[PDB]
Amino acid sequence: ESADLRALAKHLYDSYIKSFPLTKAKARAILTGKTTDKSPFVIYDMNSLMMGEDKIKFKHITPLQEQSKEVAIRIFQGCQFRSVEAVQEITEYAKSIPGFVNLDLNDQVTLLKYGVHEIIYTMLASLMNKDGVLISEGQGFMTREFLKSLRKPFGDFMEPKFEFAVKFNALELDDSDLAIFIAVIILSGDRPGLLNVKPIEDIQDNLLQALELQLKLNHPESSQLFAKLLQKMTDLRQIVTEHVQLLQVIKKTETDMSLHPLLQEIYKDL
Protein backbone atom coordinates (compact mmCIF):
# COMPACT_ATOMS: atom_id res chain seq x y z
CA GLU A 1 0.00 0.00 0.00
CA SER A 2 1.45 3.36 -1.08
CA ALA A 3 -0.47 4.66 1.93
CA ASP A 4 1.97 2.84 4.19
CA LEU A 5 5.11 4.20 2.55
CA ARG A 6 3.77 7.75 2.36
CA ALA A 7 2.83 7.29 6.01
CA LEU A 8 6.29 6.01 6.93
CA ALA A 9 7.93 8.82 4.93
CA LYS A 10 6.04 11.42 6.94
CA HIS A 11 6.65 9.61 10.22
CA LEU A 12 10.42 9.47 9.80
CA TYR A 13 10.44 13.04 8.53
CA ASP A 14 8.52 14.14 11.65
CA SER A 15 11.02 12.35 13.92
CA TYR A 16 14.00 13.63 11.93
CA ILE A 17 12.89 17.20 12.63
CA LYS A 18 12.16 16.59 16.31
CA SER A 19 15.56 14.93 16.64
CA PHE A 20 17.89 17.09 14.59
CA PRO A 21 18.05 20.79 15.57
CA LEU A 22 19.93 22.08 12.51
CA THR A 23 18.01 20.91 9.41
CA LYS A 24 19.18 21.31 5.82
CA ALA A 25 16.38 23.79 5.10
CA LYS A 26 17.87 25.80 7.92
CA ALA A 27 21.60 25.32 7.27
CA ARG A 28 20.87 26.12 3.61
CA ALA A 29 19.24 29.45 4.47
CA ILE A 30 22.29 30.45 6.52
CA LEU A 31 24.75 29.16 3.93
CA THR A 32 25.04 30.26 0.30
CA GLY A 33 21.39 31.21 0.70
CA LYS A 34 20.62 34.75 1.84
CA THR A 35 18.13 35.30 4.67
CA THR A 36 19.75 38.51 5.96
CA ASP A 37 18.45 38.68 9.54
CA LYS A 38 21.40 37.16 11.42
CA SER A 39 24.74 36.27 9.84
CA PRO A 40 27.18 33.63 11.21
CA PHE A 41 30.57 34.53 12.60
CA VAL A 42 33.05 33.56 9.92
CA ILE A 43 36.31 31.87 10.77
CA TYR A 44 38.92 32.09 8.04
CA ASP A 45 42.17 32.57 9.98
CA MET A 46 44.12 31.96 13.19
CA ASN A 47 42.60 35.27 14.33
CA SER A 48 38.97 34.60 13.48
CA LEU A 49 39.14 31.42 15.55
CA MET A 50 40.87 33.17 18.45
CA MET A 51 38.60 36.20 18.33
CA GLY A 52 35.71 33.81 17.87
CA GLU A 53 35.87 31.19 20.62
CA ASP A 54 35.41 33.57 23.55
CA LYS A 55 32.66 35.24 21.53
CA ILE A 56 30.82 32.19 20.17
CA LYS A 57 29.19 29.58 22.41
CA PHE A 58 31.53 26.57 22.20
CA LYS A 59 32.03 23.83 24.80
CA HIS A 60 35.62 22.69 25.41
CA ILE A 61 37.92 25.64 26.16
CA THR A 62 38.48 29.40 25.90
CA PRO A 63 40.68 31.02 23.21
CA LEU A 64 44.34 31.01 24.26
CA GLN A 65 47.25 30.74 21.83
CA GLU A 66 50.67 31.19 23.44
CA GLN A 67 52.73 28.01 23.83
CA SER A 68 49.61 26.31 25.20
CA LYS A 69 48.33 23.40 23.09
CA GLU A 70 47.86 23.63 19.32
CA VAL A 71 44.95 25.28 17.49
CA ALA A 72 44.49 22.23 15.27
CA ILE A 73 44.12 19.89 18.25
CA ARG A 74 41.50 22.11 19.82
CA ILE A 75 39.62 22.08 16.52
CA PHE A 76 39.77 18.34 15.88
CA GLN A 77 38.66 17.69 19.46
CA GLY A 78 35.77 20.05 18.82
CA CYS A 79 34.60 17.69 16.11
CA GLN A 80 34.66 14.81 18.58
CA PHE A 81 32.45 16.61 21.11
CA ARG A 82 29.94 17.50 18.41
CA SER A 83 29.93 14.07 16.83
CA VAL A 84 29.29 12.58 20.28
CA GLU A 85 26.30 14.90 20.46
CA ALA A 86 25.28 13.72 17.02
CA VAL A 87 25.54 10.05 18.02
CA GLN A 88 22.99 10.79 20.73
CA GLU A 89 20.62 12.54 18.35
CA ILE A 90 20.90 9.71 15.82
CA THR A 91 20.33 7.05 18.49
CA GLU A 92 17.00 8.66 19.34
CA TYR A 93 16.11 8.91 15.67
CA ALA A 94 16.67 5.21 14.99
CA LYS A 95 14.40 4.53 17.93
CA SER A 96 11.49 5.95 15.95
CA ILE A 97 12.19 3.71 12.98
CA PRO A 98 9.39 1.08 12.92
CA GLY A 99 10.65 -2.27 14.15
CA PHE A 100 14.00 -0.90 15.28
CA VAL A 101 13.46 -1.31 19.02
CA ASN A 102 11.69 -4.63 18.66
CA LEU A 103 15.02 -6.04 17.49
CA ASP A 104 17.61 -7.78 19.62
CA LEU A 105 19.23 -5.15 21.82
CA ASN A 106 22.66 -6.42 20.77
CA ASP A 107 21.72 -5.80 17.15
CA GLN A 108 20.39 -2.32 17.81
CA VAL A 109 23.72 -1.49 19.42
CA THR A 110 25.59 -3.05 16.48
CA LEU A 111 23.41 -1.28 13.90
CA LEU A 112 24.16 1.99 15.66
CA LYS A 113 27.84 1.34 16.32
CA TYR A 114 28.50 1.12 12.59
CA GLY A 115 25.88 3.46 11.15
CA VAL A 116 26.59 6.51 13.25
CA HIS A 117 29.71 7.53 11.28
CA GLU A 118 28.00 7.22 7.91
CA ILE A 119 24.93 9.13 9.13
CA ILE A 120 27.23 11.83 10.45
CA TYR A 121 28.98 12.59 7.15
CA THR A 122 25.67 12.38 5.37
CA MET A 123 24.19 15.21 7.44
CA LEU A 124 27.39 17.22 7.76
CA ALA A 125 27.05 17.64 4.03
CA SER A 126 23.74 19.39 4.80
CA LEU A 127 25.78 22.02 6.63
CA MET A 128 28.50 22.20 3.96
CA ASN A 129 29.12 23.94 0.68
CA LYS A 130 32.23 24.36 -1.53
CA ASP A 131 33.71 26.94 0.83
CA GLY A 132 33.04 25.77 4.37
CA VAL A 133 30.85 24.15 7.00
CA LEU A 134 28.46 25.81 9.42
CA ILE A 135 29.73 25.60 12.98
CA SER A 136 28.22 25.73 16.46
CA GLU A 137 24.54 25.00 15.85
CA GLY A 138 25.06 27.18 12.79
CA GLN A 139 26.28 30.24 14.69
CA GLY A 140 29.58 30.06 12.85
CA PHE A 141 31.16 29.22 9.53
CA MET A 142 34.67 27.79 9.51
CA THR A 143 35.91 28.28 5.96
CA ARG A 144 37.19 25.32 3.94
CA GLU A 145 40.49 27.16 3.36
CA PHE A 146 41.30 27.55 7.05
CA LEU A 147 40.75 23.84 7.57
CA LYS A 148 43.35 23.08 4.91
CA SER A 149 45.82 25.45 6.56
CA LEU A 150 45.63 23.32 9.71
CA ARG A 151 48.50 21.10 10.89
CA LYS A 152 49.87 18.38 8.61
CA PRO A 153 47.59 15.62 10.00
CA PHE A 154 44.50 17.78 10.57
CA GLY A 155 44.72 19.69 7.30
CA ASP A 156 43.62 16.71 5.23
CA PHE A 157 40.80 15.69 7.56
CA MET A 158 37.75 17.49 6.18
CA GLU A 159 38.76 17.63 2.51
CA PRO A 160 37.40 14.19 1.75
CA LYS A 161 34.19 15.24 3.57
CA PHE A 162 34.05 18.40 1.44
CA GLU A 163 34.43 16.53 -1.84
CA PHE A 164 31.78 14.06 -0.74
CA ALA A 165 29.40 16.84 0.32
CA VAL A 166 29.89 18.80 -2.89
CA LYS A 167 28.91 15.86 -5.06
CA PHE A 168 26.24 14.71 -2.58
CA ASN A 169 24.52 18.09 -2.35
CA ALA A 170 24.36 18.04 -6.15
CA LEU A 171 21.58 15.45 -5.73
CA GLU A 172 19.65 18.34 -4.16
CA LEU A 173 17.95 16.23 -1.50
CA ASP A 174 15.70 17.85 1.10
CA ASP A 175 15.25 16.77 4.73
CA SER A 176 12.14 14.70 3.90
CA ASP A 177 14.42 12.69 1.60
CA LEU A 178 17.40 12.37 3.98
CA ALA A 179 15.04 11.23 6.72
CA ILE A 180 14.37 7.96 4.89
CA PHE A 181 17.89 7.70 3.49
CA ILE A 182 19.29 7.94 7.02
CA ALA A 183 16.86 5.17 8.05
CA VAL A 184 18.04 2.94 5.18
CA ILE A 185 21.61 3.39 6.49
CA ILE A 186 20.89 2.31 10.06
CA LEU A 187 18.96 -0.80 9.05
CA SER A 188 22.00 -2.13 7.23
CA GLY A 189 21.98 -5.92 7.27
CA ASP A 190 25.69 -6.26 6.56
CA ARG A 191 27.08 -4.89 9.80
CA PRO A 192 29.60 -7.26 11.36
CA GLY A 193 28.35 -9.20 14.36
CA LEU A 194 24.56 -8.97 13.88
CA LEU A 195 22.72 -11.96 15.38
CA ASN A 196 19.45 -11.87 13.43
CA VAL A 197 19.64 -10.23 10.02
CA LYS A 198 16.20 -11.21 8.72
CA PRO A 199 14.25 -8.55 10.70
CA ILE A 200 16.91 -5.98 9.91
CA GLU A 201 16.67 -6.50 6.16
CA ASP A 202 12.87 -6.66 6.27
CA ILE A 203 12.75 -3.19 7.78
CA GLN A 204 15.33 -1.82 5.34
CA ASP A 205 13.46 -3.42 2.41
CA ASN A 206 10.46 -1.50 3.60
CA LEU A 207 12.51 1.67 4.04
CA LEU A 208 13.94 1.31 0.54
CA GLN A 209 10.49 1.05 -1.04
CA ALA A 210 9.61 4.16 0.96
CA LEU A 211 12.62 6.12 -0.31
CA GLU A 212 11.84 5.10 -3.88
CA LEU A 213 8.32 6.61 -3.80
CA GLN A 214 9.37 9.69 -1.80
CA LEU A 215 12.03 10.43 -4.42
CA LYS A 216 9.78 9.78 -7.42
CA LEU A 217 7.01 12.06 -6.09
CA ASN A 218 9.44 14.60 -4.67
CA HIS A 219 11.64 14.82 -7.79
CA PRO A 220 9.58 13.62 -10.76
CA GLU A 221 12.05 15.23 -13.15
CA SER A 222 15.14 13.78 -11.44
CA SER A 223 15.75 10.54 -13.33
CA GLN A 224 16.83 7.33 -11.63
CA LEU A 225 17.80 9.36 -8.51
CA PHE A 226 17.00 6.47 -6.22
CA ALA A 227 19.77 4.57 -7.95
CA LYS A 228 22.21 7.47 -7.58
CA LEU A 229 21.55 8.05 -3.89
CA LEU A 230 22.16 4.38 -3.12
CA GLN A 231 25.40 4.76 -5.03
CA LYS A 232 26.67 7.51 -2.73
CA MET A 233 26.79 4.91 0.03
CA THR A 234 29.96 3.54 -1.50
CA ASP A 235 31.46 6.98 -0.96
CA LEU A 236 30.12 7.15 2.56
CA ARG A 237 31.81 3.86 3.34
CA GLN A 238 35.12 5.07 1.90
CA ILE A 239 34.71 8.37 3.72
CA VAL A 240 34.19 6.40 6.94
CA THR A 241 37.09 4.01 6.40
CA GLU A 242 39.54 6.68 5.26
CA HIS A 243 38.56 8.46 8.47
CA VAL A 244 39.68 5.71 10.85
CA GLN A 245 42.90 5.66 8.82
CA LEU A 246 43.67 9.33 9.55
CA LEU A 247 42.53 8.70 13.10
CA GLN A 248 45.23 6.12 13.85
CA VAL A 249 47.81 8.59 12.52
CA ILE A 250 46.45 11.14 15.01
CA LYS A 251 46.61 8.39 17.61
CA LYS A 252 50.31 8.32 16.70
CA THR A 253 50.64 11.94 17.84
CA GLU A 254 48.76 12.70 21.08
CA THR A 255 48.72 10.04 23.81
CA ASP A 256 50.21 9.73 27.32
CA MET A 257 48.84 12.49 29.57
CA SER A 258 47.52 11.66 33.05
CA LEU A 259 44.79 14.32 32.67
CA HIS A 260 42.91 12.73 29.75
CA PRO A 261 41.83 9.50 31.53
CA LEU A 262 38.32 10.84 32.07
CA LEU A 263 38.08 12.99 28.94
CA GLN A 264 39.62 10.38 26.66
CA GLU A 265 37.12 7.99 28.21
CA ILE A 266 34.11 9.97 27.02
CA TYR A 267 35.51 9.54 23.51
CA LYS A 268 35.76 5.89 22.45
CA ASP A 269 35.83 5.52 18.66
CA LEU A 270 32.41 6.78 17.58
Ligand X SMILES: CCc1ccc(O[C@@H](Cc2ccccc2)C(=O)O)cc1
Burial grade of 3 (CB within 10 A; 0-12, 13-18, 19 or more): exposed
82 binds ligand X (CB under 6 A): yes
Span from 42-50, 63-71, 79-87, 227-235 in contact with ligand X (CB under 6 A): 79-87
Query: Binding marks (x or -) toward a second copy, 167..186, rule CB under 8 A?
Result: x-------------------
Q: How far is the CB of 212 from a second copy (least distance, A)?
A: 7
Distance from C-alpha of 149 to C-alpha of 164, rounded to nearest angstrom: 19
Q: Count of CB atoms within 10 A of residue 217's CB?
A: 12
List the single partner that 194 binds among a second copy, ligand X, none, CB under 5 to 8 Å by kind.
Answer: none
Residue 81 assigned as binding residue: yes
209 binds a second copy (CB under 8 A): yes
Residues with Cβ within 8 Å of residue 56, at least 6 apart in sequence: 41, 135, 136, 139, 140
230 binds a second copy (CB under 8 A): yes
Span from 6-14, 42-50, 144-152, 223-231 in contact with a second copy (CB under 8 A): 223-231
Q: What proportions of the chain, in percent to the nearest 5, are helix, strand and coil?
A: 60, 5, 35
List the single partner that 102 binds among a second copy, ligand X, none, CB under 5 to 8 Å by kind.
Answer: none
* β strands within 122-232, DSSP E: 128-129, 132-135, 140-143
Which of 42, 40, 84, 38 minimizes the C-alpha distance to 59?
Answer: 84
Q: Which residues bind a second copy (CB under 8 A)?
A: 167, 190, 205, 208-209, 212, 223-224, 226-227, 230-231, 233-235, 237-238, 241
